[PDB]
Design a protein around this motif. Sequence first.
Motif, short mmCIF file in Angstrom:
data_model
loop_
_atom_site.label_atom_id
_atom_site.label_comp_id
_atom_site.label_asym_id
_atom_site.label_seq_id
_atom_site.Cartn_x
_atom_site.Cartn_y
_atom_site.Cartn_z
N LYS A 4 -9.06 -2.91 1.74
CA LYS A 4 -9.37 -1.49 1.76
C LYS A 4 -8.09 -0.63 1.64
O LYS A 4 -7.17 -0.77 2.45
CB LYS A 4 -10.16 -1.14 3.01
CG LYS A 4 -10.99 0.11 2.83
CD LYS A 4 -10.84 1.05 4.00
CE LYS A 4 -11.84 0.78 5.09
NZ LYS A 4 -11.75 1.91 6.04
N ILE A 5 -8.02 0.21 0.61
CA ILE A 5 -6.81 0.99 0.29
C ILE A 5 -7.13 2.48 0.14
O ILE A 5 -8.11 2.85 -0.52
CB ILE A 5 -6.11 0.47 -0.99
CG1 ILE A 5 -5.65 -1.00 -0.81
CG2 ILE A 5 -4.89 1.33 -1.33
CD1 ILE A 5 -5.65 -1.86 -2.06
N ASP A 6 -6.30 3.33 0.77
CA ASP A 6 -6.44 4.80 0.75
C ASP A 6 -6.29 5.37 -0.64
O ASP A 6 -5.51 4.87 -1.45
CB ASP A 6 -5.39 5.46 1.67
CG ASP A 6 -5.81 6.84 2.17
OD1 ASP A 6 -6.25 7.71 1.38
OD2 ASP A 6 -5.67 7.08 3.38
N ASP A 7 -7.03 6.45 -0.91
CA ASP A 7 -6.98 7.13 -2.22
C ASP A 7 -5.63 7.79 -2.53
O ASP A 7 -5.33 8.06 -3.68
CB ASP A 7 -8.12 8.16 -2.36
CG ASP A 7 -9.51 7.50 -2.55
OD1 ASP A 7 -9.59 6.34 -3.02
OD2 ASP A 7 -10.53 8.14 -2.22
N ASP A 8 -4.82 8.03 -1.49
CA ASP A 8 -3.43 8.51 -1.65
C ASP A 8 -2.57 7.58 -2.49
O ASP A 8 -1.82 8.06 -3.36
CB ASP A 8 -2.75 8.71 -0.28
CG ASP A 8 -3.24 9.95 0.46
OD1 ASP A 8 -4.20 10.62 0.01
OD2 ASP A 8 -2.65 10.26 1.51
N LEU A 9 -2.65 6.27 -2.21
CA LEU A 9 -1.95 5.27 -3.02
C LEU A 9 -2.38 5.30 -4.49
O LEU A 9 -1.53 5.27 -5.41
CB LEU A 9 -2.13 3.86 -2.45
CG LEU A 9 -1.19 3.62 -1.27
CD1 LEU A 9 -1.78 2.68 -0.22
CD2 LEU A 9 0.14 3.11 -1.77
N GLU A 11 -3.95 7.77 -6.01
CA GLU A 11 -3.53 9.08 -6.49
C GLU A 11 -2.08 9.08 -6.85
O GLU A 11 -1.75 9.56 -7.91
CB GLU A 11 -3.79 10.20 -5.48
CG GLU A 11 -5.24 10.64 -5.42
#
Length: 54
Positions: A4-9, A11
Amino acid sequence: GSKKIDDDLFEELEEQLLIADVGVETTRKIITNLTEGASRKQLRDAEALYGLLK
């Protein structure tokens, strides 16, 4: 399995791609137009010179 990876990365990555992409295309237009311009000038000058005949 799942990471699971944040949309910031994603982006940030997409942003960096855009930047790099823009740099690449800007560089390519410029080199190519100047190099085409260099070509055009060899032809023009060579023809001019050849214009002088008797």
